[PDB]
Design a protein around this ligand. Structure first.
Ligand SMILES: Cn1cnc(S(=O)(=O)N(CCN(Cc2cncn2C)c2ccc(C#N)cc2)Cc2ccccc2)c1
Ligand SMILES: CC(C)=CCC/C(C)=C/CC/C(C)=C/COP(=O)(O)OP(=O)(O)O
Ligand SMILES: [Zn+2]
Lengths: 407, 323
């Protein structure tokens, strides 16, 4: 019909999705109301300006932003001097989603830099001469896999990597993030991620790990950083994804988990929040929404017959709308929420989440939903590693040609 | 000595007492990637840090240098590691270092490194006597700080400081009953003290929650807590629950209350209740209302639930295909 608004956020019923504070005001409701007011303006801007909405992903702008960053950054990124492999990963993966090729001179230059970041005793550091750390180690491995050349693969010292992992392993099943460092669920994920891709998993490496992760699920249904902590989208993604790698998803109560994450999508904004009664944020478009392809695959492996055959169990349309309308910077790059500044982290994960929302797949079934112009469609991403599904297969196959260190 | 923000601050390459050391430039290679254009101050401090790290110089002057390197980038875990080496090696007074770390956390409370550093100090000194009060101050500025709550749980658990936390929880719930971090802390305290098997305790907890729900029907935290403390034994184990919720439909309705009803019916159907079929249709009715009107953002979830209930609780569910 002519009167029918094709955009979910702009329909008149949508106004009913605003916060109801029951006339009881607290810091939480006040802050939530501020955000909703700002998002409402974005939605209403087309009406007040008397224009028909058009949702366009600013590919060219984002490309320039990334292309430059891959070489040079302002001193605004001094606070990330210990996370430079992350910067390599975020930027390469963004380009990959946008389907932009990586010049071979760039690829070789990335490889050489990561070699300087690699520790003599295994793992990668945040920069040359810095001690090894599991987070930048995860980022480095992912970047080399995106590049995917023989040169890239050979950078990783597999013997030492395994030794490094062992030195971090705890008796209770967890891993330190680094020597003399802290423990939380992220470290289990980082370890499982690099260990599986490079084929260095021994019979005992992950003894007790699935059980320790299972202790992190709480009364909310989601997963916390350590046993006893509030459930959070970042830690929940890491936990489930690690379990999937270890083939132990069933150690969790998948049902309470599913109910928790689906509740994390904001009815008004359309994006995801990181925990109950906090604010929406573009990066959760991946950490939170990325859980649904994981649950689908897990529940299906248990023969769940009620599973939809064309959609993930979240509002794909509304998420795309939030990202496209609220999370783009006009000059290129993406962001947390309106009023916030762009950065390579949010560029990586907003696009990752967008891809998830565009692409559904379960064995033989395939179905896409692309909001706005068709040029918006991105390359797909793997829900466990957050790199191209092809790059995952390519890497795993290649390293399977080697024997697990020590045989 | 010389603060990093001092108007009279001087680069290290212009300091006499550092004249013997050659700075060590960063090795980024012949053609760098993700290269950061550091400021003068930054590059100067870290060129000198690389020198002392490389020589493993464990001196008073190196100790002071780590303060400046941390100030420039508190997320540099390598600098933090060296600093802890110097603390032990130089036999530095640890309460003085406590004074230092509390000031840094005050100004950068959302940093992993600083909280971990505080923990190591408390471990070394075996003294938690300042912790609850310090954390309270951080929570007074941001009542949801994840690192803060994590540190609080660690301290209480390791040193068995349970006796006053419930009182603290009640205070914060007063200020903001929507604070999910506080509801989590409430569950944390009770689980590790009396537990939820004590009927008097469980009874108390449910009354309070329902209370709060009555005061603020749309506050999701209270709903999740109520569900969380009853779901292990099974919702259907509590027959009075259903009617009492239905009695809030009139003037306390919410998509939350509707969703709870569906959870009760779901469990009922699982523990073979009376009126198998009557209960089913009630649930599918609600699953539809939610997916089409009351909670459309979750339409895909609610359709899945309704489809699941049908798949296993319909009168035809156990009937052979030949019948
Ligand atoms: C508050 N928070 C939300 N998510 C996280 S985190 O995944 O653990 N992460 C968040 C750090 N973080 C803050 C943030 C993320 N989303 C919102 N915020 C405020 C952040 C890190 C890098 C960039 C860039 N460029 C921008 C923001 C950590 C981190 C830091 C460096 C590298 C990798 C992860 C923290
Ligand atoms: C592999 C790897 C490193 C994964 C990252 C996982 C991740 C996103 C963790 C987030 C942890 C955290 C400190 C959240 C709270 O920040 P906040 O309180 O500022 O944000 P919030 O208000 O949205 O919870
Ligand atoms: Zn974010």
């Amino acid at each position: 019909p002519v009167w029918s608004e094709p955009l979910y956020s702009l329909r008149p019923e949508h106004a009913r999705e605003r916060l109801q504070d029951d006339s009881v005001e607290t810091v939480t409701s006040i802050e939530q109301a501020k955000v909703e007011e700002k998002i409402q303006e974005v939605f209403s801007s087309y009406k007040f300006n008397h224009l028909v909405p058009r949702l366009v992903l600013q590919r060219e702008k984002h490309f320039h932003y990334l292309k430059r960053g891959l070489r040079q950054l302002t001193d605004a990124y001094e606070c990330l001097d210990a996370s430079r492999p992350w910067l390599c990963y975020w930027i390469l993966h963004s380009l990959e989603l946008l389907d932009e090729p990586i010049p071979q001179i760039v690829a070789t230059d990335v490889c050489q830099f990561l070699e300087l970041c690699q520790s003599p005793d295994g793992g990668f550091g945040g920069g040359p001469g810095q001690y090894p750390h599991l987070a930048p180690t995860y980022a480095a491995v992912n970047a080399l896999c995106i590049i995917g050349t023989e040169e890239a693969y050979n950078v990783i010292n597999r013997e030492k990597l395994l030794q490094y992992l062992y030195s971090l392993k705890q008796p209770d099943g967890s891993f330190l993030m680094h020597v003399g460092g802290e423990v939380d669920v992220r470290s289990a994920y980082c370890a499982a991620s690099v260990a599986s891709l490079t084929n260095i998993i021994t019979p005992d490496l992950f003894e007790g790990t699935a059980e320790w992760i299972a202790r992190c699920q709480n009364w909310e249904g989601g997963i916390g950083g350590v046993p006893g902590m509030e459930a959070h989208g970042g830690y929940t993604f890491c936990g489930l994804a690690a379990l999937v790698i270890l083939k132990k998803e069933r150690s969790l109560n998948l049902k309470s988990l599913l109910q928790w994450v689906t509740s994390r999508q904001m009815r008004f904004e359309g994006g995801f929040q990181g925990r109950c009664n906090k604010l929406v944020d573009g990066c959760y478009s991946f950490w939170q929404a990325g859980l649904l392809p994981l649950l689908h695959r897990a529940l299906h492996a248990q023969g769940d017959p009620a599973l939809s055959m064309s959609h993930w169990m979240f509002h794909q349309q509304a998420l795309q709308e939030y990202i496209l309308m609220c999370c783009q910077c006009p000059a290129g790059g993406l962001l947390d929420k309106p009023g916030k500044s762009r950065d390579f982290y949010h560029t990586c994960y907003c696009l990752s989440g967008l891809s998830i929302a565009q692409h559904f797949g379960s064995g033989a079934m395939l179905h896409d939903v692309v909001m706005g112009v068709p040029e918006n469609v991105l390359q797909p991403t793997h829900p466990v590693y957050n790199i191209g599904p092809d790059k995952v297969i390519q890497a795993t196959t290649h390293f399977l040609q080697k024997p697990v260190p020590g045989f | 000595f010389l603060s990093l923000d001092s108007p009279t601050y001087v680069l290290y390459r212009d300091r006499a007492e550092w004249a013997d050391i050659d700075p060590v430039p960063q090795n980024d290679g012949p053609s760098p990637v993700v290269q950061i254009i550091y400021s003068e101050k930054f590059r100067d401090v870290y060129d000198y840090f690389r020198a002392v790290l490389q020589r493993d110089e464990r001196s008073e002057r190196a100790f002071k240098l780590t303060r400046d390197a941390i100030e420039l980038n508190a997320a540099n875990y390598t600098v933090w590691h060296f600093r802890r080496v110097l603390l032990r090696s130089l036999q530095k007074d640890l309460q003085e270092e406590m004074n230092y770390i509390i000031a840094i956390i005050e100004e950068q409370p959302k940093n992993y490194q600083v909280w971990h550093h505080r923990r190591v100090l408390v471990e070394w000194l075996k003294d938690p006597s300042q912790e609850l009060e310090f954390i309270a101050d951080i929570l007074n500025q941001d009542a949801k700080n994840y690192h803060a709550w994590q540190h609080r749980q660690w301290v209480i658990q390791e040193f068995r400081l349970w006796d006053n936390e419930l009182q603290y929880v009640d205070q914060l719930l007063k200020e903001d009953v929507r604070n999910n971090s506080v509801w989590n802390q409430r569950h944390f305290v009770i689980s590790n003290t009396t537990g939820y098997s004590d009927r008097a305790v469980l009874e108390r907890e449910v009354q309070y929650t329902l209370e709060m729900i009555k005061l603020v029907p749309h506050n999701e935290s209270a709903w999740n807590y109520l569900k969380g403390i009853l779901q292990d034994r099974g919702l259907s184990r509590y027959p009075n629950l259903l009617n009492q919720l239905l009695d809030l439909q009139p003037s306390h309705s919410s998509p939350y209350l509707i969703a709870f009803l569906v959870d009760i019916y779901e469990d009922m159907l699982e523990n073979q209740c009376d009126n198998k079929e009557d209960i089913l249709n009630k649930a599918l009715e609600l699953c539809e209302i939610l997916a089409k009107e009351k909670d459309t953002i979750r339409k895909e979830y609610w359709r899945y639930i309704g489809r699941s209930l049908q798949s296993k609780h319909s009168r035809e569910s156990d009937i052979p295909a030949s019948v």
